[PDB]
Amino acid sequence: SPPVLDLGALGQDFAADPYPTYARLRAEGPAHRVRTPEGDEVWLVVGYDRARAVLADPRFSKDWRNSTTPLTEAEAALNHNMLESDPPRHTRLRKLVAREFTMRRVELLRPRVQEIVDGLVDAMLAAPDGRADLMESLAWPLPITVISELLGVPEPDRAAFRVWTDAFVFPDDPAQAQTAMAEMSGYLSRLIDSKRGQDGEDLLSALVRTSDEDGSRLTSEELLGMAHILLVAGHETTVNLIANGMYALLSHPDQLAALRADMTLLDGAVEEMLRYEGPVESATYRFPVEPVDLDGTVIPAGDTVLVVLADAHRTPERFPDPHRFDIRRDTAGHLAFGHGIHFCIGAPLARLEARIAVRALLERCPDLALDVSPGELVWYPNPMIRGLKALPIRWR
């Protein structure tokens, strides 16, 4: 089916503000064939109700064996993860790490996350001119530092994830993203082998042991896929929640003032950051196992479907006055972390990081503000991730 719109042709204007386009589409129907800025042809599902339903609908699979579109060699190497599986494989894989990310288990990481944030912020505050780029100084370093310590990724090996992730989000090429994947995949395999038999206590070491104890519970391919998903799934997302959220807060002085006046509104503010400018613009690939009809529009089986969480969050019927960033707004039911069996397992960790980061910036940066007109900001064209290239800020 030919695309009705080529998102790439819309340019940076769409990347910066995609909402009007999604809403115009929603006004004419729930499903639309489009071409992403990358060149991929997929279906977009818009509207909160339809989005929510599709996310949990078992008729839409995440197993590539149900996609008419073949996986590339590199992707086929990291495909065996819970997010790209259906029950029972998904059920088995998720159980292996579910207990690791509960709210109570994550709470024990507060002291260390707080140290990391205080460290990064104080380093940022060393700027002789009271200016810095929040992405480079805090948004990017925080999540990678936290997850690497949890998984056991050596400090020296983290710089490479900077370049690799930039390739995944913001290429320069189709090809390039694949190259980055092959590189990272190769690295993960070597990191896993370096753990085997070393008696480490980090999560990756424990997973390696789990795989060695029972290859049926976690195969070599699934072990590699687990390392991949735990590193990727929470990196780019958390990074952009922090940057996007602060951008939202700093571009709405009234909300900043409100949070300043009552820090107990912090948790609600982070939830509205997810609703208003969540990092996941469109969910990961879903494939109908059978032809599915959405309000008259039939999506053929095997086709690629992207649920546009960004649009669901701007649906008036569900979030009144959607264009307004209101930190005290009712956010119950948002889909920023997904919905259904694939609901984010790292949500408590992401919230811990964001809440601690947001508070530190507000309590230690006197007169914190954006140091650039918003029209000068550059947003990623990637269909799944909503994010900035940089976020220049200033303080007294």
Ligand code: HEM
């Ligand atoms: C602000 C940060 C985060 C956001 C907005 C986010 C969002 C999401 C979303 C939308 C999904 C579902 C995607 C879909 O259904 O297509 C998901 C799945 C997942 N996320 Fe997160 N995530 C974040 C942080 C994390 C962190 C910190 C971890 C690390 C533990 C993580 C690990 C995962 C995993 C493993 C899954 C797969 C769940 C499954 O398939 O059962 N996420 N996340």
Ligand SMILES: CC[C@H]1OC(=O)[C@H](C)C(=O)[C@@H](C)[C@@H](O[C@H]2O[C@@H](C)C[C@@H](N(C)C)[C@H]2O)[C@@H](C)C[C@@H](C)C(=O)/C=C/[C@H]1C
């Ligand atoms: C928590 C949701 C994150 O998504 C994922 O973890 C999934 C499993 C993932 O890693 C893929 C969606 C990647 O997206 C793309 O990767 C390219 C190299 C190939 C491309 N292909 C389908 C055309 C597509 O799979 C992931 C590396 C994407 C980047 C931008 C990312 O970090 C997003 C993460 C969340 C959406």
